[PDB]
């Protein structure tokens, strides 16, 4: 199935408290494998999955050298954006950045992404065609024009179509046992009664990977998105995920209702 | 593998 590599960067200005906070994190699919945090003792890029530890000194010196450059560049960006929006030095402000590549089942380039947010809202993004920019506002146009003049998109496209694909492939092969696994969900159900008239039932999906899943409810086949309670998928802490869905309907008659789990690791859509 | 070039906003 499809795979992805993404880097996530957060830069937070600390007005009157010195250098801004910089956090960088890198994922292959749903597994984080590297981190850099300006607040931590090491000031290196650090492993967060077993299969990246085998990379040698040149890789770590190099990823450290680059993460500090991303840091330096985002520090300048926070000053630039304050200037663009004529914001005072009294407020804390956040620049966020994500980039990376998807590949398909053949491990060939599927899509690339490269986008910025300022204070929670979109600022500028590389379009799907990897040759043009969506600029959200008049300040983001100033960046768009700088980057068109300097042909930033073509350089970005080379990274995302070549280098990125290339190194994702390397990771997927080194983390073969971890990354290319599929954990089917351990299903079960629980039954409680809030009252005599209406009782509550809870469909449970545990210990699954990848994080993608769907829990729907059926009353002889329909979809009951009324009186429905779906929690966001959540990490268990051991690399797997959880999710549950529950609906309340009249007690004693609950087999007209049935819960359908659909996930990649489950060969046919298990029904309960 | 981080992108080795960076671009100022």
């Amino acid at each position, epitope marked *: 199935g499809s795979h992805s590599m993404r880097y996530f960067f957060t830069s937070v200005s600390r007005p009157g408290r010195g250098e801004p906070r910089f956090i960088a994190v890198g994922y292959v699919d749903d597994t984080q494998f590297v981190r850099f945090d300006s607040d931590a003792a090491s000031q290196r890029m650090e492993p967060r999955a077993p299969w990246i530890e085998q990379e040698g000194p040149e890789y770590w010196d190099g990823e450290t050298r680059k993460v500090k450059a991303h840091s*330096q560049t985002h520090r300048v960006d926070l000053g630039t954006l304050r200037g663009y929006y004529n914001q005072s030095e009294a407020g804390s402000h956040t620049v966020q950045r994500m980039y990376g590549c998807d590949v398909g089942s053949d491990w060939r380039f599927l899509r690339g992404y490269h986008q910025y947010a300022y204070d929670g809202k979109d600022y500028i993004a590389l379009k799907e065609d990897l040759r043009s920019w969506t600029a959200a506002d008049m300040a983001a146009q100033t960046t768009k024009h700088k980057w068109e*003049a300097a042909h930033v998109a*073509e350089q970005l496209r*080379a990274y995302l179509e070549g*280098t990125c694909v290339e190194w994702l492939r390397r990771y997927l092969e080194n983390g073969k046992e971890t990354l290319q696994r599929t954990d089917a969900p351990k299903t079960h159900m629980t039954h409680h009664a809030v009252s005599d008239h209406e009782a509550t039932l809870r469909c449970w999906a545990l210990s699954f990977y990848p994080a993608e899943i769907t829990l729907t409810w059926q009353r002889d086949g329909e979809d009951q998105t009324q009186d429905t309670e779906l929690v966001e998928t959540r990490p268990a802490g051991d690399g797997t995920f959880q999710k549950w869905a529950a609906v309340v309907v009249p007690s004693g008659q609950e087999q007209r209702y049935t819960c359908h789990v659909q996930h990649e690791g489950l060969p046919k859509p298990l029904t309960l | *593998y981080l992108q*080795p*070039r*960076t*671009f100022l906003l």
Partner: T-cell receptor, first 111, second 108 residues
């Protein structure tokens, strides 16, 4: 219009100190110093982003020190010059990666 | 060397095709330039190329091959003003690393 450098030529007695100056293109946040000797390419010396010195060639001596105090002009200084310092000293600036060079300072160090 | 250029002064007759090539050490490079430097002057950019394939511009053709880490420049119909040192330039992070240069002599 362009990167400017002064002096264009400079003779210095071995042992003395010399200072070159570089006025870059005002919108260019990135500024670079190179050294070039006849028959060879420009060798990278140091790199500034705004006023911060980000990189330094690992071979560069502590007799060489560069500064860009307000993120505009830049100076490069050599202390206790020896004969092997004679070279073309090139300034360059860039908005991103493409480099635009000044006309250089050609330094001669003689006894 | 991080950037390697074809050795030896190249001598090519007025009106012929001159041809320069270059390899670079680090596969993660993204920015690639050809600079021209007259004998007593500073490097001046003549073109950049960022994607695989050919870039044509007047009498100049650049080629880039990322898989093999190879940069080329072809000058057709060489003028005497093409006599210069040709510098291959490749990014290492956000700085440009230059090769030693290839001298081109256009013969009358």
């Amino acid at each position: 219009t362009g990167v400017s450098q002064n002096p264009r030529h400079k003779i210095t007695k071995r042992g003395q100190n010399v200072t070159f100056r570089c006025d870059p293109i005002s919108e260019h946040n990135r500024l670079y110093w190179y050294r070039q000797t006849l028959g060879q390419g420009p060798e990278f010396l140091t790199y500034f982003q705004n006023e911060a010195q980000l990189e330094k060639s690992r071979l560069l001596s502590d007799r060489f020190s560069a500064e860009r105090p307000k993120g505009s002009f830049s100076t490069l200084e050599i202390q206790r010059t020896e004969q092997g310092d004679s070279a073309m000293y090139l300034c360059a600036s860039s908005p991103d990666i493409e480099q635009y060079f000044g006309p250089g300072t050609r330094l001669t160090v003689t006894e | 060397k991080e950037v390697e250029q074809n050795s030896g002064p190249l001598s090519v007759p007025e009106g012929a095709i001159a041809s320069l090539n270059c390899t670079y050490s680090d596969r993660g490079s993204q920015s690639f330039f050809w600079y021209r430097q007259y004998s007593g002057k500073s490097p001046e950019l003549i073109m950049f190329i960022y994607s695989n394939g050919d870039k044509e511009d007047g009498r100049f053709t650049a080629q880039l091959n990322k898989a093999s880490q190879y940069v080329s420049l072809l000058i057709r119909d060489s003028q005497p003003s093409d006599s210069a040192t040709y510098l291959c330039a490749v990014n290492r992070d956000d700085k440009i690393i230059f090769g030693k240069g290839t001298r081109l002599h256009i013969l009358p």
